[PDB]
Design a protein around this ligand. Structure first.
Ligand code: HEM
Length: 152
């Protein structure tokens, strides 16, 4: 649960992402894959990437970063009223991709890391607080659907 002022901060931060969605998406995925190499094993189309240089050179990885962040941005713009947008993603991630909730924690922290790396000094403490709360809400509503499905 976020206040109106917290949602305003989230959507202000998101404007930074929307100026370069592919560059942000690329770096988020690279941070996830390099920090948590077991996550790479869930992607049949990226498991061939052995080095970060290969990851950086991959145009398909940048494409997937655009898909991921476009979906998250659509959810964030609903300011919590995201049941219809979140349900298919929870279902596909539990039943088809088999993504444990832990990996959604990993990517949440990676988004925070990337924002500080690309906007040092311009991602303030209030903005970090509000973005963190928004990613927690996203993760928590996915977790409720995971429990319904019995997925661990
Ligand atoms: C911010 C969180 C994330 C969002 C919004 C997101 C969004 C999406 C979307 C929109 C798709 C394509 C449609 C679909 O299959 O449902 C996708 C595919 C996928 N997601 Fe996620 N995702 C997230 C986190 C993750 C994480 C943490 C993992 C794995 C560690 C992951 C693994 C996958 C896989 C394996 C695919 C299929 C890729 C393919 O082979 O083309 N997702 N995701």
């Amino acid at each position: 649960g976020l206040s109106d002022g917290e949602w305003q901060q989230v959507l202000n931060v998101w404007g930074k992402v929307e100026a370069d969605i592919a560059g942000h998406g690329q770096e988020v995925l690279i941070r996830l894959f390099t920090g948590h190499p077991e996550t790479l094993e869930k992607f049949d189309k990226f498991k061939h990437l052995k080095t970060e240089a290969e990851m950086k050179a991959s145009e398909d990885l940048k494409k997937h970063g655009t898909v991921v962040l476009t979906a998250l941005g659509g959810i964030l713009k609903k300011k919590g009223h995201h049941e219809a947008e979140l349900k298919p993603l929870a279902q596909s991630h539990a039943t088809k991709h088999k993504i444990p909730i832990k990996y959604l924690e990993f990517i949440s922290d990676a988004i925070i890391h990337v924002l500080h790396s690309k906007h040092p000094g311009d991602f303030g403490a209030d903005a970090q607080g509000a973005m963190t709360k928004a990613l927690e809400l996203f993760r928590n509503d996915i977790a409720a659907k995971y429990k319904e499905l019995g997925f661990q």
